Design a protein around this motif. Structure first.
Motif, mmCIF file in Angstrom:
data_model
loop_
_atom_site.group_PDB
_atom_site.id
_atom_site.type_symbol
_atom_site.label_atom_id
_atom_site.label_comp_id
_atom_site.label_asym_id
_atom_site.label_seq_id
_atom_site.Cartn_x
_atom_site.Cartn_y
_atom_site.Cartn_z
ATOM 1 N N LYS A 154 0.789 -1.248 0.000
ATOM 2 C CA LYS A 154 0.000 0.000 0.000
ATOM 3 C C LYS A 154 0.808 1.279 0.000
ATOM 4 O O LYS A 154 0.523 2.211 -0.775
ATOM 5 C CB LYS A 154 -0.970 0.024 1.195
ATOM 6 C CG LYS A 154 -1.987 -1.129 0.993
ATOM 7 C CD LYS A 154 -3.400 -0.601 1.186
ATOM 8 C CE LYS A 154 -3.608 0.815 0.694
ATOM 9 N NZ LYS A 154 -4.425 1.116 -0.513
ATOM 10 N N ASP A 155 1.904 1.372 0.688
ATOM 11 C CA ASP A 155 2.734 2.573 0.840
ATOM 12 C C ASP A 155 3.771 2.817 -0.243
ATOM 13 O O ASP A 155 4.613 3.708 0.026
ATOM 14 C CB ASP A 155 3.518 2.456 2.146
ATOM 15 C CG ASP A 155 2.700 2.806 3.376
ATOM 16 O OD1 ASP A 155 1.640 3.396 3.186
ATOM 17 O OD2 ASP A 155 3.114 2.577 4.516
ATOM 18 N N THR A 175 2.746 2.838 -3.484
ATOM 19 C CA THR A 175 2.089 3.404 -4.698
ATOM 20 C C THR A 175 1.030 4.380 -4.238
ATOM 21 O O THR A 175 0.578 4.244 -3.075
ATOM 22 C CB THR A 175 1.453 2.165 -5.460
ATOM 23 O OG1 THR A 175 0.560 2.613 -6.528
ATOM 24 C CG2 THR A 175 0.630 1.301 -4.469
HETATM 25 RB RB LIG Z 1 -0.876 4.777 -0.667
#
Ligand SMILES: [Rb+]
Ligand SMILES: [Rb+]
Lengths: 26, 10, 248
Positions: free
Chosen positions: C166-167, C169
């Motif tokens: 998650k972190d 993009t």
């Molecule tokens: Rb993100």
């Protein structure tokens, strides 16, 4: 018959990098 | 860059 | 595959090439799950932003291949699509959520030493192996560079933890996706690349010795970019759709 390779699993032969996968499944 | 496939198969 | 290695003969017998009839070019990878069914990414067939909307009469499935470009006479088998099915909820507009299609071949294909299908995970299989740190294997004839293999390449990669995915993009990651790749720190490279989409992400079971396809090559940003990772369709989360089109 799925997932057992005619040339590897079925002849009890390992491919050259599978051990890298098995060693990681702790 | 591909070699010719048989027309059988088109 | 970037930073991968040449596949050994018969190493991935479920490995299928998706090939454009005219002009004759490689579209994507795919896998054989039965004798009449091929599993690939929906973005291989349909992607309106890029005017892509392939039909059944538009392509050829080539199974049993090692070489990217030669026609391997007596080894490989070329087939015809009888039908294509895209997931009714594939999200091409936002994030390529549910990037999965099924292809029904015009005739069953016979198994040989080079042609053999991969297993589809059952719920307990996905549970024990779909873990952060565990390595999976991708194969494909795709770009070796962010340029083309002469033979099928392989690379083994670790699954990365949801949060790290998650972190890395700005895209919205869903429960139908998992990402895989090495951290810049681990300082190991390897990744799928253009050409590679639709191929399989597979793991071998330590309990029964089988190969299970767990993912489909979906999207990523660049090839072998640091801090960026590959996104794959979560095949077990979509399992129930897969059974649906196959029995119906
Ligand atoms: Rb993100
Ligand atoms: Rb990476």
């Amino acid at each position: 018959d799925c997932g057992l390779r005619p040339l590897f699993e079925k002849k009890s032969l390992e491919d050259k990098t599978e051990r890298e996968l098995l060693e990681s499944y702790i | 860059d591909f070699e010719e496939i048989p027309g059988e198969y088109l | 595959i970037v930073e991968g290695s040449d596949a050994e003969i018969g190493m991935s017998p479920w490995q299928v090439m998706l090939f454009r009839k005219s002009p004759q070019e490689l579209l994507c990878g795919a896998s054989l799950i039965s004798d009449r069914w091929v599993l690939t990414a929906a973005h291989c067939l349909l992607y309106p932003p890029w005017d892509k909307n392939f039909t059944e009469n538009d392509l050829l499935v080539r199974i049993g291949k090692h070489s990217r470009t030669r026609y391997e006479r007596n080894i490989e088998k070329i087939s015809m699509l009888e039908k294509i099915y895209i997931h009714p909820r594939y999200n091409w507009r936002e994030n390529l959520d549910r990037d999965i299609a099924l292809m029904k071949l015009k005739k069953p294909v016979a198994f040989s030493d080079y042609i053999h299908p991969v297993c589809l995970p059952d719920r307990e299989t996905a549970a024990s192996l779909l873990q952060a740190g565990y390595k999976g294997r991708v194969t494909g004839w795709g770009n070796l560079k962010e340029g083309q293999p002469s033979v099928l390449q392989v690379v083994n990669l670790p699954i990365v933890e949801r949060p790290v995915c998650k972190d890395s993009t700005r895209i919205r990651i869903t429960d139908n996706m998992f990402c895989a790749g090495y951290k810049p720190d681990e300082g190991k490279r390897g990744d799928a690349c253009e050409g590679d989409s639709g191929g399989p992400f597979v793991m071998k079971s330590p309990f029964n010795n089988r190969w299970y396809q767990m993912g489909i090559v979906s999207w990523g940003e660049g090839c072998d970019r640091d801090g960026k990772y590959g996104f794959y369709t979560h095949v077990f989360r979509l399992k129930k759709w897969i059974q649906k089109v196959i029995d119906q």
